[PDB]
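Troubleshooting log. The previous run stalled partway through. Resubmitting the same two chains, unchanged.
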Amino acid sequence: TMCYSHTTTSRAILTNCGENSCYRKSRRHPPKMVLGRGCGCPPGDDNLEVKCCTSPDKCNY
Amino acid sequence: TMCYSHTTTSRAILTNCGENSCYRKSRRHPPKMVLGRGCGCPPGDDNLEVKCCTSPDKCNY
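Second attempt completed without errors. Output:
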């Protein structure tokens, strides 16, 4: 899948993740904002929601 | 000054910073979002803008 990718400070770029999923990592507590996007599907926890998707392209918007 | 305060994952709380300023730390590159708020006035750089203020209360919104 094609996915957006950035850390909390890096420029957002497009990345071909191939056969991995895309993820979108957001904070759960207000103010709710996306902290990171990339390839794979890392674990969320009490403060962080991690959405993982494989379709469409750029699904981790 | 009274200031908002949170890290990238912590719950936002109100904090009496006393005689320090408030800061608001934002990313410069899209998507532009606030990564952190607190007491003091840490340095920004190429990826991070840091606004520092002393008035009004909660100025680092």
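Takeaways: Residues 1-61 of chain B form a domain with the CD59 fold (CATH 2.10.60.10). Chain B has one domain: 1-61.
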